[PDB]
Amino acid sequence: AFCNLRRCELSCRSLGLLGKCIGEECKCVPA
């Protein structure tokens, strides 16, 4: 629906950590 979660998870991996959806947005979180 409103979150391209794998694109988010790989963007977070590229910085150094896991990704999650919030809603119409996604964010990164610790391992």
DSSP string, 8-28: HHHHHHHHTSEEEE-SSSEEE
Query: Are 20 and 27 spatial neighbours (Cβ–Cβ below 8 Å)?
Result: yes
Buried b / exposed e over 20-29, threshold 16 CB at 10 Å, is eeeeeebebe
Which residue range is the domain that position 27 belongs to? 1-31
Question: 3: closest CA among 23, 17, 18?
Answer: 23
In whole angstroms, what is the distance from residue 1 CA to residue 15 CA?
25
In whole angstroms, what is the distance from residue 3 CA to residue 20 CA?
9
Domain count for the chain, please give it: 1
Residue 5 is encoded by which pair of tokens? 């979660």
